[PDB]
Amino acid sequence: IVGGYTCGANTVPYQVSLNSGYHFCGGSLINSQWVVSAAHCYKSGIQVRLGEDNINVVEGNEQFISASKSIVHPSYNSNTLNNDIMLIKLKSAASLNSRVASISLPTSCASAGTQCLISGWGNTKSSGTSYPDVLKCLKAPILSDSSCKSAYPGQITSNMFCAGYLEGGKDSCQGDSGGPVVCSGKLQGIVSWGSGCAQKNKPGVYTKVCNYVSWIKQTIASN
Ligand SMILES: [Ca+2]
16 A cells, blocks of 8 residues: 555454465455455465464464465456456355454445545555555545546446545555455455556556446355
């Protein structure tokens, strides 16, 4: 996260870390057995790490559970990143408590102007690299569809929205991919892509989760 603040241990209880030997992407816990992340975070051998704050220290609230199957969206396009969303089923159900909790799926799409919380363990610098060990947080507004498309001409689909600041300085970044954008207690976005991080007129682009709610619900119901 560039230009954010330290969340505080376990203040974002639905945040997961996807680990294949090292942290490579974020994700959100949507019920005791399913995680939603970005389709571009797909790989085999994923271990889901719940209840994390410092991903390099075992502090006592962690649950490490292996994934039993991953399901990338049927229309994921890796060249355009349209439909960048994937579901991971855990091999065992997570034990839910105040520090490990699920986030609700939205009933409505959130409008431009809504302030949201974005979190993850991605890079914290706009040029150069420094990866945090503890979870970082950023409050950012959803931007209008016209600001988003004027920033990324020919690249924004209806399954995408922008959030952040056109002045730059604050944004998610590499490593935050797959992670949550929560607005009014509902998961509305998944960290997906952007041009660099925290650049002027280059806000983050996020997968619009409210378009995928029937696919999530039907897939969970049969798998
Ligand atoms: Ca830890």
